[PDB]
């Protein structure tokens with residue numbers, strides 16, 4: 249379904265700032281953006297809400313919906329399942345809002361194979377040391393999950409240098425600066441949606 253404005257795919261390693269930046273964008277520009285609410289089998293973190301951050305489901309329920317053809321894409325990431333349901337994107341497109349998706353690098357490649365034609369943005373830390381610091385400060389994951397996330401970060405940061413893969417790469421050193429660069433990448437779309 250190609251409906252409405254060009255969607256936005258935001259990716260980057262675990263801990264890079266994706267959710268922090270997207271929450272800011274949806275607060276400032278609530279009238280023109282809508283968030284695709286993915287399914288995940290991971291457990292919710294304090295403050296996360298079902299139907300807002302994710303649909304938190306069991307492996308059994310997610311497998312039922314996968315088998316029925318309910319997903320545009322799905323991926324295994326650091327021991328859990330994640331995916332973008334068809335209805336998650338339809339809900340935002342039906343409101344004629346810019347659909348924002350937060351997905352991993354596998355999801356980026358999955359979406360490249362669809363008809364969605366998004367802009368692809370990668371948010372990256374200044375270094376893997378800083379990434380680990382931010383992840384361990386958050387400490388919402390077990391040690392095993394952190395190890396998996398740090399390994400995925402190193403692999404996916406190298407893979408994201410692929411030419412033509414990402415339209416924009418933003419280094420999240422300072423959040424205020426990264427957020428301005430996020431809006432810069434979307435500035436013409438934001439202006440059109442306001443008109």
Ligand SMILES: Nc1ncnc2c1ncn2[C@@H]1O[C@H](COP(=O)(O)OP(=O)(O)O)[C@@H](O)[C@H]1O
Pocket residue numbers: 260261262263264265266267268269382383385386420421422423
């Ligand atoms: N520029 C920054 N400087 C320091 N800490 C940050 C910055 N941006 C985000 N963080 C923190 O890093 C952690 C990871 O950010 P988050 O948005 O949860 O990552 P993601 O959603 O990409 O996995 C959070 O604790 C967040 O508060």
Ligand SMILES: Nc1nc2c(ncn2[C@@H]2O[C@H](COP(=O)(O)O)[C@@H](O)[C@H]2O)c(=O)[nH]1
Pocket residue numbers: 259260261262263266286287290321322323325330331332350351352353354355356
């Ligand atoms: N492929 C895919 N990845 C997702 C989806 N939802 C979240 N992710 C990704 O899974 C990783 C872990 O998410 P987190 O557990 O930190 O919320 C992040 O890279 C995030 O973007 C999804 O629907 N599809």
Ligand code: ALF
Pocket residue numbers: 261262263264266267
């Ligand atoms: F979106 Al995450 F660690 F919170 F990749």
Ligand SMILES: [Mg+2]
Pocket residue numbers: 266267268
């Ligand atoms: Mg997040």
